[PDB]
Amino acid sequence: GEFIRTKPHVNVGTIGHVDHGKTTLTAALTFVTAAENPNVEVKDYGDIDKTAHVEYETAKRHYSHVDCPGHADYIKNMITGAAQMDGAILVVSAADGPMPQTREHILLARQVGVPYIVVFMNKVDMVDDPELLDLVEMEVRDLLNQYEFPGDEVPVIRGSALLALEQMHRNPKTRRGENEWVDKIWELLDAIDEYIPTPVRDVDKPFLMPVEDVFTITGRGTVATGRIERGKVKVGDEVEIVGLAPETRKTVVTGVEMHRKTLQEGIAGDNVGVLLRGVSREEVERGQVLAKPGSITPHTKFEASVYVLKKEEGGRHTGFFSGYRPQFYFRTTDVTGVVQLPPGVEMVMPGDNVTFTVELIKPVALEEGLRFAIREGGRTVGAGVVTKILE
Numbered sequence: 001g002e003f004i005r006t007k008p009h010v011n012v013g014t015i016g017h018v019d020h021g022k023t024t025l026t027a028a029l030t031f032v033t034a035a036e037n038p039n040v041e042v043k044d045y046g047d048i049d050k051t052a053h054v055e056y057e058t059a060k061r062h063y064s065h066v067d068c069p070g071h072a073d074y075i076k077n078m079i080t081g082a083a084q085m086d087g088a089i090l091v092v093s094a095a096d097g098p099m100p101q102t103r104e105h106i107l108l109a110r111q112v113g114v115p116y117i118v119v120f121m122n123k124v125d126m127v128d129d130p131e132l133l134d135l136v137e138m139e140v141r142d143l144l145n146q147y148e149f150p151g152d153e154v155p156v157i158r159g160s161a162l163l164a165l166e167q168m169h170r171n172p173k174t175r176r177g178e179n180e181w182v183d184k185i186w187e188l189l190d191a192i193d194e195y196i197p198t199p200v201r202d203v204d205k206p207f208l209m210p211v212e213d214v215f216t217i218t219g220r221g222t223v224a225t226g227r228i229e230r231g232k233v234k235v236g237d238e239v240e241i242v243g244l245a246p247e248t249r250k251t252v253v254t255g256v257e258m259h260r261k262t263l264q265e266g267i268a269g270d271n272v273g274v275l276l277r278g279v280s281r282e283e284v285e286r287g288q289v290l291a292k293p294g295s296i297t298p299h300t301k302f303e304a305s306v307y308v309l310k311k312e313e314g315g316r317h318t319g320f321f322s323g324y325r326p327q328f329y330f331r332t333t334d335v336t337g338v339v340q341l342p343p344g345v346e347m348v349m350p351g352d353n354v355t356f357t358v359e360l361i362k363p364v365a366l367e368e369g370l371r372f373a374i375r376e377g378g379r380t381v382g383a384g385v386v387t388k389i390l391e
Ligand SMILES: C/C=C\C=C\[C@@H]1O[C@](O)([C@H](CC)C(=O)NC/C=C/C=C(\C)[C@@H](OC)[C@@H](C)[C@@H]2O[C@H](/C=C/C=C/C=C(\C)C(=O)c3c(O)ccn(C)c3=O)[C@H](O)[C@@H]2O)[C@H](O)[C@H](O)C1(C)C
Pocket: 079, 083, 103, 104, 107, 108, 110, 111, 112, 113, 146, 147, 148, 309, 311, 312, 313, 314, 329, 330, 331, 332, 371, 372, 373, 374, 380, 382, 383, 384
């Protein structure tokens, strides 16, 4: 099976409170579009609620969609998943309204930079009262505004992921205009096509892909998955595996796939599987980056400009201090780092911007201008930018 690039590629996903319908909507999206484009493989709700990374396309674009379980123990996974989204679909149940996770996922989306949000008010089959429905929309729009998303401008589609999914199960060929529920899914697909702009991909820069996960394709070798950040990659390309391990490893690409389909060449923006030559799953891991040889190097000590979040922004009320060892989030991983403030400075208070030094306990592919977040456990306390590599 081969994958032929024909429409602009976009990465999206589902966020929202537990049980509001993220997984059901993900399944509905694949079934609904499958009726038009045969290249769209059907994905049962049972399987997704286990892969959780599916594909589907509209007349305008090809989409890679990650369905976030959204639980607290999956926080680190949501971070990397949301970080690679061009836009997110916020699912809110019409029968419950916004709940704690609706708010939590919105803040995380903001902190990792999700550029746009499209809302899908789910389970409307459970609520008919026009007033209650308008109240829920009002609440969601206000919630979004609260975290600085353009709440008054986002699309808010009302529908039922379950009824749409069941219709497709009954008639997999159901097409647009034939079923009111299925049509609500098309309203969402249209909103996604229109509201979420297709970003400019940095395809002309040196290849770089942060590793999300590593698997062994039984009888084929190890494969590293991730979203290409910049550049391109194809079979026969030499690539370096940088960071985390003791030394940088160099190998050759033996395969490139898009949703398990042979891909001519992967480009920035594509979430692919890169099969590597002679490397075991013990030589490549999440957090490392695949890159054009010599384009990026591993480091542990650097200087950075850092903004300490205010308590009013979810951070702490106490500041940073020398010897502090929080977690530093770089691309797809997080590593402990020791903070060292300049002479004379005993503390950097919330709300202040300062430049200090850091020494990670493990090497990481670093470069000037690279952004990173600082978290202490499950709380974001700082936002920084690498300003100088020391070693
Ligand atoms: C966020 C986790 C990892 C991020 C890692 C890296 O982040 C980056 O470095 C990123 C770059 C900026 C980063 O460093 N993010 C790191 C940080 C970035 C932070 C900014 C931008 C901000 O400005 C100060 C804006 C959100 C700003 O804040 C406001 C937020 C107020 C929140 C109040 C919540 C309070 C009282 C609260 O009790 C509360 C709640 O209500 C819900 C949930 N919980 C848990 C809470 O406790 C408003 O929303 C504004 O918009 C890049 O994205 C990297 O590529 C990435 C993704 C690798």
